[PDB]
Curated annotation (Swiss-Prot), chain E:
The gene is Gadd45gip1. This is Large ribosomal subunit protein mL64. It comes from the Eukaryota. Component of the mitochondrial ribosome large subunit (39S) which comprises a 16S rRNA and about 50 distinct proteins. Interacts with GADD45A, GADD45B and GADD45G. Interacts with NR4A1 via the NR4A1 AB domain. Interacts with ATAD3A and ATAD3B. It is found in: Mitochondrion; Nucleus. Acts as a negative regulator of G1 to S cell cycle phase progression by inhibiting cyclin-dependent kinases. Inhibitory effects are additive with GADD45 proteins but also occur in the absence of GADD45 proteins. Acts as a repressor of the orphan nuclear receptor NR4A1 by inhibiting AB domain-mediated transcriptional activity. May be involved in the hormone-mediated regulation of NR4A1 transcriptional activity. May play a role in mitochondrial protein synthesis. Residues 1-23 are annotated as: Disordered. Belongs to the mitochondrion-specific ribosomal protein mL64 family. It comes from Mus musculus (Mouse).
From Swiss-Prot, chain F:
It is found in: Mitochondrion. The gene is Mrpl28. This is Large ribosomal subunit protein bL28m. Residues 1-54 form a transit peptide. The lineage of its organism: Eukaryota, Metazoa, Chordata, Craniata, Vertebrata. Belongs to the bacterial ribosomal protein bL28 family. Component of the mitochondrial ribosome large subunit (39S) which comprises a 16S rRNA and about 50 distinct proteins. Interacts with OXA1L. It comes from the Eukaryota. Coiled coil: none annotated.
UniProtKB/Swiss-Prot annotation, chain G:
Belongs to the ribonuclease III family. Mitochondrion-specific ribosomal protein mL44 subfamily. Signal peptide: none annotated. GO terms for molecular function: double-stranded RNA binding; ribonuclease III activity. Component of the 39S subunit of mitochondrial ribosome. May have a function in the assembly/stability of nascent mitochondrial polypeptides exiting the ribosome. One of its GO terms (cellular component) is plasma membrane. Disulfide bonds: none annotated. Its main location: mitochondrion. The lineage of its organism: Eukaryota, Metazoa, Chordata, Craniata, Vertebrata. This is Large ribosomal subunit protein mL44. Keywords: Endonuclease, Hydrolase, Mitochondrion, Nuclease, Ribonucleoprotein, Ribosomal protein, RNA-binding, Transit peptide. GO terms for biological process: mitochondrial translation; mitochondrial translational elongation; RNA processing. Component of the mitochondrial ribosome large subunit (39S) which comprises a 16S rRNA and about 50 distinct proteins. It is found in: Mitochondrion. It comes from the Eukaryota.
Swiss-Prot record, chain H:
This is Large ribosomal subunit protein bL20m. It comes from the Eukaryota. The lineage of its organism: Eukaryota, Metazoa, Chordata, Craniata, Vertebrata. Belongs to the bacterial ribosomal protein bL20 family. Keywords: Mitochondrion, Ribonucleoprotein, Ribosomal protein, Transit peptide. One of its GO terms (biological process) is translation.
Length: 214, 93, 55, 249, 97, 73, 87, 36
RNA sequence: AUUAAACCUUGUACCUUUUGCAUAAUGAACUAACUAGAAAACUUCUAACUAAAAGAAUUACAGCUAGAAACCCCGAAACCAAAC
């Protein structure tokens, strides 16, 4: 019984749906069990890598705080040395940030670095099984595993992923461009794809926020 | 000048450690969290510059207001004197 | 923003008309804006150079 | 899309491969070397809505035609941008778009043009003007926040004596106008254009179109002095007689 | 490695301790108590009856309404007086010119 | 470093600990309670709201006590 | 103390250059040194001269009596060039 | 950290000079340019 | 250049400053370290979105958001307060 998924939102008529092979981690040879459809406006966006470049700089430099300081002549018991703690925080436009994440998803899929999976459940929690399966499926040295929510993630995967430095497991809300670029291949659960699409596709329209959504 | 006659000790850096590997996670809390928490809320550092940025004078002024009631008398007086010199340069020259 | 409501007669009295059907089979497709409007914007630079941009 | 064909062939990109966009960053000058070495408030700030701007909203269905036009619905539909810090005090219309706006609907605007009133009435729409206090109007635009504060619905205010003549004027169609003159006034406007006056009573939705709230009443749905059970998604009505005296005061 | 649990803001009513020195004064005002009711309504537990003005507050409001806010009848009388003054001014101008 | 409690809270902390806590409650209440002296050289505002003539808007009002020096005599 | 590893490495190269000038290494034949292929060199040697040589005979000509003794001495722990030399 | 090599660059061309000129960077640099 | 280190031939030390000139005048025994351009209100450029834009407070009949782009050092005679 093939696992067939269709985009919940209306795909544009002039754009055909994107498709990929659904996989399962239950067995080594369970590479293909179904075929899924992906929204072209999410997984077939233009390859604008400068936005990805900007997002990476923003991600690294928005948390940057420098504590370097030097004393001037008036403070001596450097003419142009560091003066106290300095902040470099800045905010990119919300639409651009959403687009940057979209661009990253296309790059991984077009480059055969994205692996769509039905569920993360594993027959055993041994890290050896996970690494060997990655070798069998020719995955990259670093594999990123994403689940819908942190609370419900399978126990077996947590033990293996926690003990693996190059295989890192994150929740869906924790997904970011930096991790995707840092990790050679991305593993996404089917519910996560639907979760990601809704927020990205929700961005349509403006109805400018008169107040923060907190 | 004269230079070291020996090499510095070798340094080994792990690029896949938990800190580097997981750096940036949850930076999309706003978009992926319904915007309930703004990413500026994730800034960790001095209280007077969490979610805010400005020039040194603004940073110093904000620092004074935020912890002025908790500032030492010696520190507060020194900060006031430094601010006085800074104020004249920026606001008169 | 809700999608525009179906109208008995096009063009609309204001002048709005949805994209013509069938769509052209040309190599290049121009999609409408989120407001379902033509993506053409009049732009002026340097105060003397009139411009129009298709995005 | 031959561009996609390029993407598939290309190998996986890495963090180091990232490069700033051309011309993104300009050059900077530093003193390391010789290069930099050596050396009106009282007047209401009326905000207009054009008839042409009015027509497209109906055409796009941004505002429900069945529902009478309400300023809050325009705010909900993002028709106009109002800033309390700007302290906007008035709402009006733009004379432009008279011949591109063929529609009939009930509407209430703080200010309406005399010529515009007849044209929409000629189409069959119903137009009146009501006074919302600038503080009350700001509350009206944003109902949820004062519920969070816990404030109750207050009585709607009245215009100052400077603007009382405008609202009281029958031709202005203000809520302070004498209803007895409206039948006579409506006929006069029809004669001015000469169009045959369509009686509002004939309309099937006459009661819905002609319904008007009390001058004290901010909301047609909600009477003044009311409370809302936001947590329970319900409306709470005071049951204290003294509160009625408070409202009467 | 596995990422740490996502940061989450605590929901639900939270009552600051009045005795605590650190807590700001504005967080202990009745407006804050009214704020608690608005956020969660019945879950806050604030009695709705308290939200309405107290009788002493009511008397103050009534005085302000009468003192500063005229009624329709008072407004109408003022218009008549102004019209009479304007009418006299018009007559004075006509006879003078 | 920085003092977690401001200097003005130092007095409160001292009162809450040591012999000060052991002081009689009646005397402690007398010291703690502060009552405004009856105005003599200044007149407090009768009403809490007034209409500003320029804008014709009701605004909350505040009282400014005149500075008075009481010598030890 | 000046910090950095590149600067320290650079000085090491400076020391090596001085050491080489002060104490030149003892001469050694290219055969012992790495990246030497006798067969390739002979083929290149013949091609460079634009002349045809019998590889077996040419090797015998290069072979010397002294060379054999070293191999025999190593063996204890092959045709001479005399016939070709006379011709 | 390469200031030594900068001095060496002048020195290599000034090794054959005589006097304090050949050993003073202030003087050696001037002579090297004049020779060129 | 040269067979040849010197001979023959050619050539009025450097920085600053005076006129775009010094046979003026200042400064330098030499070695090593240290020792002097710092801010964005607006514009151009790079992009996001578009009668809208911006994650609250702003501007708007193509505007609006983000990013990048900038303005030294040492040295007086003095003046005042508080101690000694």
């Amino acid at each position: 019984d093939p696992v067939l998924r269709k985009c919940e939102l209306r795909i544009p008529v002039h754009r055909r749906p994107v498709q990929a092979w659904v996989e399962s981690l239950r067995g080594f040879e369970q590479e293909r069990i179904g075929l899924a459809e992906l929204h072209p406006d999410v997984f077939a966006t233009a390859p604008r890598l400068d936005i990805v470049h900007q997002v990476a700089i923003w991600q690294r430099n928005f948390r940057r705080i420098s504590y370097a300081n030097t004393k001037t002549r008036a403070e001596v018991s450097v003419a142009h040395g560091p003066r106290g703690p300095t902040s470099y925080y800045y905010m990119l436009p919300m639409k651009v940030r959403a687009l940057g994440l979209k661009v990253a998803l296309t790059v991984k899929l077009m480059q055969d670095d994205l692996h769509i999976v039905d569920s993360l459940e594993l027959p055993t929690a041994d890290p050896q099984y996970l690494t060997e399966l990655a070798q069998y499926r020719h995955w990259g040295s670093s594999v990123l595993l994403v689940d819908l929510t942190h609370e419900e993630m399978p126990k077996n995967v947590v033990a293996a992923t926690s003990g693996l430095n190059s295989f890192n497991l994150i929740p869906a809300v924790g997904l970011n461009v930096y991790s995707m670029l840092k990790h050679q291949t991305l593993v996404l659960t089917l519910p996560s794809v639907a979760f990601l699409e809704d927020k990205l596709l929700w961005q349509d329209s403006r109805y400018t926020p008169l107040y923060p959504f907190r | 000048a004269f230079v070291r006659l020996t090499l510095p000790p070798p340094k080994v850096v792990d690029r896949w450690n938990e800190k580097r590997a997981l750096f940036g996670v949850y930076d999309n809390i706003g978009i992926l969290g319904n915007f309930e928490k703004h990413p500026k809320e994730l800034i960790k550092g001095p209280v007077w510059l969490r979610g805010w940025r400005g020039n040194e004078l603004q940073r110093c002024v904000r620092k004074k207001k935020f912890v002025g009631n908790r500032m030492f008398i010696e520190d507060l007086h020194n900060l006031n004197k430094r601010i006085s010199y800074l104020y004249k340069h920026f606001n008169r020259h | 923003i809700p999608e525009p409501p179906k109208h008995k007669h096009y063009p609309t009295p204001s002048g709005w008309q949805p994209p013509r059907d069938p769509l052209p089979s040309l190599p290049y497709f121009v999609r409408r804006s989120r407001m379902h409007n033509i993506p053409v914007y009049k732009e002026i630079t340097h105060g003397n150079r009139q411009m129009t941009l298709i995005r | 899309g031959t561009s996609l064909d390029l993407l598939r062939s290309l190998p996986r990109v890495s963090l180091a491969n990232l490069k700033p966009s051309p011309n993104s960053r300009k050059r900077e000058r530093r003193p390391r070397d010789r290069r930099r070495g050596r050396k009106h408030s009282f007047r209401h700030q009326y905000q207009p809505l054009s008839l042409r701007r009015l027509q497209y909203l109906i055409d796009l269905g941004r505002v429900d035609p069945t529902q009478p036009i309400d300023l809050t619905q325009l705010v909900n539909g993002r028709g106009v941008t109002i800033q309390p810090l700007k302290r906007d005090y008035g709402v009006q219309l733009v004379e432009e778009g008279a011949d591109t706006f063929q529609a009939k609907i009930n509407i209430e605007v703080q200010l309406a043009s005399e010529l515009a009133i007849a044209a929409i009435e000629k189409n069959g729409g119903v137009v009146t003007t009501a006074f919302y206090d600038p503080r009350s109007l700001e509350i009206l635009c944003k109902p949820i926040p004062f519920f969070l504060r816990g404030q109750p619905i207050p009585k709607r205010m009245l215009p100052p004596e400077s603007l009382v003549p405008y609202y009281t004027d029958a031709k202005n169609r203000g809520y302070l106008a004498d209803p007895a003159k409206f039948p006579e006034a409506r006929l006069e406007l029809a004669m001015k254009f000469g169009y045959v006056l369509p009686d509002i009573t004939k309309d099937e939705l006459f009661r819905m179109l002609s319904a008007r709230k009390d001058p004290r009443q901010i909301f047609f749905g909600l009477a003044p002095g009311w409370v809302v059970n936001m947590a329970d998604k319900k409306i709470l009505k005071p049951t204290d007689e003294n509160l009625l005296k408070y409202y009467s005061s | 490695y596995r990422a740490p649990p996502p940061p989450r803001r605590r929901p639900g009513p939270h009552s600051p301790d009045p005795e605590n020195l650190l807590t700001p004064r504005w967080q202990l005002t009745p407006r804050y108590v009214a704020k608690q009711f608005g956020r969660h309504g019945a879950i806050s537990g604030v009695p709705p009856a308290s939200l309405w003005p107290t009788p002493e507050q009511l008397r103050e409001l009534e005085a302000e309404e009468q003192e500063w806010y005229p009624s329709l009848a008072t407004m109408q009388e003022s218009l008549r007086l102004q019209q009479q003054a304007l009418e006299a001014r018009r007559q004075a101008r006509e006879q003078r010119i | 470093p920085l003092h977690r409690y401001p200097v003005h809270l130092w007095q409160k902390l001292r009162l809450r600990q040591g012999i000060c806590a052991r002081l009689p409650a009646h005397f402690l209440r007398s010291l703690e309670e502060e009552r405004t002296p009856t105005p003599v050289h200044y007149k407090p505002h009768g009403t809490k709201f007034k209409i500003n003539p320029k804008n014709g808007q009701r605004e909350r009002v505040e009282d400014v006590p005149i500075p008075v020096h009481y010598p030890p005599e | 103390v000046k910090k950095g590893f590149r600067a320290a490495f650079r000085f090491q190269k400076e020391l090596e250059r001085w050491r080489l000038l002060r104490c030149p290494p003892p001469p050694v034949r290219r055969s012992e040194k790495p990246n030497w292929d006798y067969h390739a060199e002979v083929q290149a040697f013949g091609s460079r001269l634009q002349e045809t040589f019998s590889l077996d005979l040419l090797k015998t000509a290069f072979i010397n009596s002294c060379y054999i003794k070293s191999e025999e001495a190593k063996r204890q722990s092959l045709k001479d060039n005399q016939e070709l030399f006379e011709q | 950290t390469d200031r030594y090599w900068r001095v060496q660059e002048v020195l290599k061309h000034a090794q054959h000079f005589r006097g304090r000129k050949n050993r003073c960077y202030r003087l050696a640099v001037r002579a090297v340019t004049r020779a060129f």
